[PDB]
Design an enzyme around this catalytic site. Structure first.
Site, mmCIF file in Angstrom:
data_model
loop_
_atom_site.group_PDB
_atom_site.id
_atom_site.type_symbol
_atom_site.label_atom_id
_atom_site.label_comp_id
_atom_site.label_asym_id
_atom_site.label_seq_id
_atom_site.Cartn_x
_atom_site.Cartn_y
_atom_site.Cartn_z
ATOM 1 N N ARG C 60 -6.413 -1.641 -3.171
ATOM 2 C CA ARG C 60 -5.919 -1.057 -1.936
ATOM 3 C C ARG C 60 -4.631 -0.272 -2.168
ATOM 4 O O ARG C 60 -3.667 -0.821 -2.692
ATOM 5 C CB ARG C 60 -5.684 -2.162 -0.908
ATOM 6 C CG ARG C 60 -5.378 -1.645 0.479
ATOM 7 C CD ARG C 60 -5.315 -2.794 1.438
ATOM 8 N NE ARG C 60 -4.645 -2.424 2.679
ATOM 9 C CZ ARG C 60 -3.411 -2.807 3.020
ATOM 10 N NH1 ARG C 60 -2.670 -3.607 2.227
ATOM 11 N NH2 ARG C 60 -2.911 -2.382 4.176
ATOM 12 N N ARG C 107 8.496 3.034 14.766
ATOM 13 C CA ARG C 107 9.566 2.566 13.922
ATOM 14 C C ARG C 107 10.906 2.666 14.581
ATOM 15 O O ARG C 107 11.172 3.578 15.348
ATOM 16 C CB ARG C 107 9.617 3.382 12.655
ATOM 17 C CG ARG C 107 8.417 3.203 11.837
ATOM 18 C CD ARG C 107 8.679 3.606 10.412
ATOM 19 N NE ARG C 107 7.730 2.925 9.524
ATOM 20 C CZ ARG C 107 7.779 1.618 9.236
ATOM 21 N NH1 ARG C 107 8.739 0.828 9.760
ATOM 22 N NH2 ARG C 107 6.861 1.105 8.429
ATOM 23 N N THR C 315 -4.903 -10.254 5.336
ATOM 24 C CA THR C 315 -3.535 -10.438 5.755
ATOM 25 C C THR C 315 -3.163 -11.877 5.837
ATOM 26 O O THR C 315 -3.695 -12.625 6.648
ATOM 27 C CB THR C 315 -3.198 -9.722 7.109
ATOM 28 O OG1 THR C 315 -3.394 -8.299 6.970
ATOM 29 C CG2 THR C 315 -1.699 -9.968 7.489
#
Ligand code: K
Ligand code: K
Ligand code: K
Ligand code: K
Ligand code: MN
Ligand code: MN
Ligand code: MN
Ligand code: MN
Lengths: 491, 512, 517, 517
Positions: C60, C107, C315
């Site tokens: 990944r 963000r 995850t």
């Protein structure tokens, strides 16, 4: 839809039952093979032709009656009627010939038995073909004559009266009949069998594995090929079913005798058990006797007979049979016709979902490449509602293993072995095709034309339409025992 | 073991089939109730007593034949034979009485057998003048419009469908035909016209008189002939009048249309009779079984009695032993799910009435033990919708509790049978011993598989609680006495929190 | 026995559970493919060789960090490590390379005085989120700047804002003409430019920025094999990705990552169009209450399984290992249950990109996966798949299912398929044979993509085609066996199902044969 | 719908999986009882109150640490916090107290004048394992003292020693005359008094030291309700415990902790004798390879479910929360799968005894357990239990199953049972109703022990008996309903199954009734 598809897709048996639809026409060759007994009423070549069109698969010769010559004519006429459509190889229907053994039958000789009266066994006198009768009936013992109607109580007192004719049934329960499963006659009969090339033997009164070993033996080496179907006719046979099965090619649930040897209320348990088991084993089972008697005399069956035939099929039976309905009654063809019609409906009513599941789930693993192929072929068929599985088989074994799992798709069995083609009728849903061509130079090509032959004949009789999918099962090399390939083709 | 217990414990239906054991004796009261038809052969009080002993639960009166007076005697004798064992309340068996409607029948115009040659010519007259003049070539017939509904190339069947007539010249005086299936014809026999839309009504002036007679004499159940649609039963209910709200109505499904509109008929009837006879003529013989199987399935799901009928044992009208098919017929009916099985000629006229009743008894017991309860109870629970009726909730709890301890019986107190009916819905294997003060309730409850009614005679106790207990005790006692229950058995007991119907809500576990 | 065979033969799941035996060694290649995330810790060619041995199947690349160049090294190194075992074709393990899109990040700002500085948001203090372009930079103890303007528009009086990987939390007490006057709910240390999540409130921001577009183009250029596409909320969102991917990239598989309530809500429509799904627990575990993920994860996998499309569990499966050499008791069970749930792939993020135990982590997922793989109650599972997959008339499907059935019947060691795009391998695996799917193909790419399918083991065939098509098929099969013996999938005496077609080129698989080794 | 009702009505497990809906709010008291371990961080009366509100059902006292006095305060505070809500009998929550035995543990020793100080056992370095009394207090980087004299006699060369949650690992290579000279394999920060385990080597330590025995007696004196019995290896080990427990403690429930290979191997026999099981993943996860726990966990739960006896899942379910306010993605799924596996209780150790988020931790288990409780495929699960539980003639068992069936049929909100020892409640829960089991008892102790059974909600009845027994029963049932309305288990219009008996005193439950609210 048709073929009771809404019922076929139900999630439970109850549901399934609830969705059975009388307007949903069957649409599929009937798979339950019909065995008809040959007699005065069904012996004429021309009568035989008609019975073939109505759907006779197997002719039963009943060696309980008639002479050797008498039966050879029987055999000769079947063969003639059958060879009368060899006109056209795509359409031609093989017909098995089954010798049905006399065995320890006990019969009368050549007047009304008055309940209460003193009646001897050596109006009041009954001659018996079993001399040892007076070695095996103790005092306070029962003797049943002519289909269990006439009851005697051993010097004997009549317990149930009834009208008695000439040469009829004798049954002796409680007592273990030392009378041998195989008289000198049966032996001669079975030899006759091999000479004339009968395909199948229905072996009366089988009580134990030995009884079949007997039959095989008598059959001789000239007859390894002959299939042996053990008729279970009494309490002992039932009790030792397993062992009998292990050794027989399949079973005949002989309800007649059985329905006398054990209490009438119980047959159904026997019938249901036995079929269950043969099913599990993968071996032909026949349901027999009295399925349609009223028709010996009337053009329409009674409400019970009808449901009998359907339940036989739903039970799992590979073959259903007719005795007097075909040998002597006034409606032989009409009777065949009715079994045909009923069988198709019941065939479409089978809950394949539950049935295939359960067979997979109980058949033990296996390492026989033929078996492995079969089950995969059967699974594949269900996935695409394939119209047919077409197999090349040399002895039928490959066809037999497919049928074991009860595909809904027809098994079109292509073979060069006239005999294999006849015997394969013992297996539900197997439609044999006899291949006549001389082998091709290239083995691969010879396989192809066989498959092609299978399709073609397939189109022609209405098993397959353009656009259908067909599963094709072959092997990696010539000669029997090596089936191991499954292919999916579109028509 | 017994009651086919090894088979009962199988993991699959195949496996279950495989373990069915002929030496495993049944050991349980038979649950499938037997309806016996009353005729010359079974009308004598003393004959009736014998039939009660052999297991008759419901007497069918066939209003297709006989007169009002003729049937009142029928009823009067039944009641007598039945009251002959009131000597002992623990042992006393109630018996339902069922009026079976005549309905839109069609019959031919006495010990006289005219033979209708194959491939001959037959005239069907409907002319008064020929209301008996029916020879080799002539049959009169009590439906005028036969001439009006049957087109050319249409089919006319006579006498259980055994005789066949194709119309081929529809002319001034009547129906010129040809005899397809020939045969021996008799005085006054059923006529059927498939394809035709027989415009006759489900309820003649007669049926209406019949049903009224029904109410007067207190029949318990009506089998309503040729029901084709919900309205048809509304008719019956109507005719039945207010004096007869209690009477159970059982629609007989006798033809293609009934079958097609089964759902709507069911929703309205108290139960169903699968009338194989007529049905076996109206639709092709090969198909009945699908009908029979379908309707029983459906009534099972619905919770309502269903009857399998006609020709289950005919050979016995004449012989003392059934043919191999008739036997399996009976078993499979029961295995199918039937609540009742029935006998017509086998009891009304045949030479073996009691022997016939006996056989059904004997067979039903074996099939009853052959029922794969594991799959069956699972499937019912799984298809029956949730519910909030305390009575239904109690019933299913009670049926579960019973299976857990192989209880010998569930004993319910019931005022209309409803509580008993809901228990049997689920098909306990344990017997439902139903204790009621309502003579009628006790009769009607035979329509429910596995319900054994007990009629309680005592005047109510001062204390309602006590009155309940004695009823329960009465249940047990009678229970011991007929061999439903032995000391040490567990029994489930179902009662309610207050008197009067509709409040069943309690389930208790007792040891005998 | 082994491979939990006694448990495999049980008549019910409960039973099955009861017969799970800790001493029954697994005995079967692990089928669950492992996706390892590439970062500082796992970028060195040599580190990459080690991770391939320990069982890495998919690399990944995380476009949420790093530059185009930075990822081209990433890709270059992987390919190098991988080509290092091309020494022996029988043994060679292909490795997919998956671009993982950045997508609608939100963000905070650069921190007063530093990209390296941190500020602490004390529990219960007064805090201001502004969208005022000026403080994009002047953020501190009482203030955070966010690059989603509409925030002071989408969060009701009493809503929550999750900052930094979900660890800081704020509740809007008053709506301000310059910024949301909030209270700190969960305290914490706050960095430069970290992530925001906004549960409940709808977020309109586009599923594909100008960046994502450039990224995906970079993807096509360097020949990535798979795109994991962040925040997919609807069918259009993948159409976007396909589009951007351009014609030079029809081959690329697109894996939709479900990262929030809406994607869940529109799962069906997303699936219909994606090549498979990634259960993005991270974001997901923030957009929707933590108690709920499991239902999501379990749902999505069920559904993918039904659909026959790869699904990835992802995850935090093994986070403690970013720092420790042994997993905690939970992480272990997490992995097993993922596999047991039905997952096709399981993944590692921090555990491989940055942690001190990259290889060890890969090793563990390997070890666990093998055990869970053997614990799978195939009896129920194959039954249920057969029972719910619709009839079919595609000769390839038909062959697949018969091949799968045939294998169970003789405990075949493997099904060997010849495949040009993997479709044929993919259909066999749909049904979850217990036997391995040894897939033989000439398509380097197909062999990489196929790892997305549970229990498919790809073999890249290098030989030039034979004059006679039939012969060429045979060698391919032979090549399959041989390689098979060599890695311990097959022993002499085993039975093997072989699946081929009646003519060259894709789409015509239709033959199944039974062979003994 | 809610309570994953569409999932609940699926025809297969696959299907069920597919219909799991994240927006389907649970709507049902949580059934899985929570065991929280008492420590510095959860000892204060006030903290304890909070933990009760958040859902603590059982307080675990860990006799691996602390003194008799130290634990009596523990006990004394629990009881205080608990008696603080006796204000209102309808809402009052009983709380079990469980003594957790020390048993054959093996700790390293205190550190060089260092209490909260540490030392690093460097990877590869030289380490000496002593038993010299003098070195007890002199633990260091090159030296570790162990409280197991015989360590030197059992660990042959190339035998393995592991320290502190298995994170530190030592390779004995030398046998000296004053200690074992070991190579460090897995290096790391070593603390004071940390755990040691010795795989491969059998440990001749007895399941019950002179201490354990004193402990157990203390247990009886202060009336603990449950004993979690460490390292149970065999039936005898519990007979020991029963014995020690003395006659003053027949009532105490005994829960055998399975902590190692042998316990696993002899599970059946331990079960037959214990009141229930604790799957001790901690020790277990060291004694056997980490990859295998899950099989053990799944096996044991299955088996206790089949038996009808409580089973606890324990250790490391939520560790990250010792330090953070939000669980990691694995911990969450751990809890849900424990519940879906079939666990009766789930537990917290560090998470409650010492970490910075004790209440938050309890809260999370609560929240997760509710969701998983609604995800349970009851259709399959109830079928399988009926199908495997043997016939029975115990009127209590018969009534229970009928009652459980009845409840399913009408989606009853609750089964309300009058029970004297909880046995009637326990039998209902065996079948896993979805309706709540509201257990009404006069036996404070029974009410406390009943938490060991999934979905049993105990109510303590305080009233003096009525003159008429029948009336006394009715008020108890009424009390059940009322309390039930009050906490939101029941609404007007719900159906409720009520289970009672034909006469006073235990053992005679035999009646089931259907009532509408
Ligand atoms: K014979
Ligand atoms: K009638
Ligand atoms: K990303
Ligand atoms: K401890
Ligand atoms: Mn015979
Ligand atoms: Mn009729
Ligand atoms: Mn994300
Ligand atoms: Mn421990």
């Amino acid at each position: 839809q048709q073929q009771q598809l809404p019922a076929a897709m139900a999630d439970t048996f109850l549901e399934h039952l609830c969705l059975l639809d009388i307007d949903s026409e069957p649409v599929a060759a009937r798979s339950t093979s019909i065995i008809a007994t040959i007699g005065p009423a069904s012996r004429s070549v021309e009568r035989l032709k008609e019975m073939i069109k109505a759907g006779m698969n197997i002719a039963r010769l009943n060696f309980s009656h008639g002479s050797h010559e008498y039966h050879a004519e029987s055999i000769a006429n079947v063969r003639e009627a059958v060879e009368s459509f060899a006109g056209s190889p795509l359409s031609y229907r093989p017909v098995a010939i089954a010798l049905d053994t006399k065995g320890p039958e006990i019969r009368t000789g050549i007047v009304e038995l008055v309940k209460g009266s003193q009646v001897l066994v050596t109006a009041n006198t009954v001659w018996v073909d079993y001399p040892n009768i007076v070695r095996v009936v103790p005092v306070g013992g029962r003797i049943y004559i002519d289909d269990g109607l006439i009851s005697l109580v051993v010097v004997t007192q009549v317990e149930n009266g009834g009208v008695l004719g000439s040469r009829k049934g004798v049954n002796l329960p409680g007592a273990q009949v030392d009378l041998p499963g195989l008289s000198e006659q049966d032996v001669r009969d079975l030899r006759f069998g091999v000479e004339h090339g009968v395909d199948i033997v229905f072996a009366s009164f089988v009580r134990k594995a030995s009884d079949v070993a007997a039959v095989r033996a008598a059959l001789g080496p000239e007859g390894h090929g002959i299939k042996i179907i053990s008729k279970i006719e009494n309490h002992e046979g039932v009790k030792r079913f397993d062992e009998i099965l292990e050794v027989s090619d399949g079973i005949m649930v002989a309800r007649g005798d059985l329905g006398i040897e054990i209490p009438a209320e119980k047959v159904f348990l026997a019938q249901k058990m036995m079929i269950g088991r043969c099913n599990l084993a993968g071996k032909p089972v026949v349901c027999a006797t009295q399925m349609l008697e009223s028709m010996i005399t009337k053009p329409r069956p009674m409400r019970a007979e009808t449901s009998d035939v359907a339940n036989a099929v739903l039970d799992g039976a590979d073959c259903i049979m007719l005795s007097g309905e075909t040998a002597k009654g006034n409606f032989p063809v009409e009777a065949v016709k009715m079994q045909h019609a009923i069988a198709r409906e019941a065939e479409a009513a089978v809950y394949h979902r539950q049935l295939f599941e359960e067979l997979r789930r109980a058949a033990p693993l296996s390492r026989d490449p033929t078996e492995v192929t079969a089950i995969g072929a059967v699974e594949a068929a269900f996935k695409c509602c394939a119209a047919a599985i077409i197999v090349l088989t040399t002895t039928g074994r490959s066809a037999q293993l497919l049928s074991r799992y009860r595909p809904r798709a027809a098994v079109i069995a292509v073979t060069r072995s006239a005999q294999a083609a006849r015997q394969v009728h013992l297996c539900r849903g197997v439609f044999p095709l006899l291949y006549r061509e001389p082998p091709e130079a290239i083995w691969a090509d010879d396989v192809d034309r066989r498959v092609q032959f299978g399709i073609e004949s397939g189109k022609l009789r209405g098993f397959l339409r353009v656009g259908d999918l067909v599963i094709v099962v072959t092997g990696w090399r010539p000669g029997s025992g090596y089936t191991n390939i499954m292919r999916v083709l579109s028509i």
